[PDB]
Amino acid sequence: MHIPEGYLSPQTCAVMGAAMVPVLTVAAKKVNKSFDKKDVPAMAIGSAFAFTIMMFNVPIPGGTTAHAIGATLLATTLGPWAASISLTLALFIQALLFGDGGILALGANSFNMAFIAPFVGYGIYRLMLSLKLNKVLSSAIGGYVGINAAALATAIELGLQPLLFHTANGTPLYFPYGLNVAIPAMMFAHLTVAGIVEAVITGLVVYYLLEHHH
Numbered sequence: 001m002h003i004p005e006g007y008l009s010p011q012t013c014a015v016m017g018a019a020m021v022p023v024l025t026v027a028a029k030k031v032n033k034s035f036d037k038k039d040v041p042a043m044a045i046g047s048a049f050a051f052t053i054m055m056f057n058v059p060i061p062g063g064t065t066a067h068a069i070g071a072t073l074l075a076t077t078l079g080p081w082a083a084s085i086s087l088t089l090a091l092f093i094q095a096l097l098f099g100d101g102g103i104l105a106l107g108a109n110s111f112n113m114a115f116i117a118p119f120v121g122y123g124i125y126r127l128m129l130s131l132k133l134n135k136v137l138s139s140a141i142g143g144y145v146g147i148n149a150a151a152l153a154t155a156i157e158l159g160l161q162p163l164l165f166h167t168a169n170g171t172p173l174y175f176p177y178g179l180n181v182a183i184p185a186m187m188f189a190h191l192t193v194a195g196i197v198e199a200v201i202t203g204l205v206v207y208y209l210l211e212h213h214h
């Protein structure tokens with residue numbers, strides 16, 4: 001779902017970045033207060049793991065791409081504030097060193113994948129636990145819902161572009177497809193393939209982690 005450079009207006013990029021700043025600021029303070037050095041390797045591993053699985057995507061006509069993220073997996077294991085930083089780091093490296101997702105679109109992409117995805121996933125995860133579902137199942141359901149919420153956010157950011165940024169003749173200045181295209185396109189991919197892959201990967205790793213072995 002990574003948004004490439006030029007898909008979003010500079011104004012949209014600026015708003016998303018200004019929203020993402022307080023988040024990461026708060027995240028940073030939360031982690032500083034309750035993580036000790038020994039916990040830092042786990043963030044970095046989670047970060048490298050999310051990066052790796054995100055590289056495996058499929059283009060979506062009408063949208064951007066579809067791939068898993070591991071956002072809820074990081075959120076259930078590191079806490080959402082630390083998942084935030086790990087996931088954002090992965091996105092930073094992807095954009096800056098690999099050209100995957102635009103640089104100015106970084107506030108947008110991290111808002112979707114490094115904020116919405118793990119916080120929705122974790123919230124859902126806590127809910128399922130309170131319904132007495134086991135951690136493996138709750139995390140997997142949280143994963144599905146989280147990635148789909150991020151897909152929706154992405155689809156809405158893109159879809160608003162032709163509506164808000166066009167020439168006097170009504171020609172799109174950036175992303176050219178509206179909500180009518182972007183939402184069914186992005187949501188269909190994520191409700192039926194990417195969400196499931198995400199759920200499976202989340203539950204699997206969570207399972208083996210709980211087993212501490214195999």
Ligand SMILES: [Co+2]
Pocket residue numbers: 001002003057065066067
């Ligand atoms: Co993406």
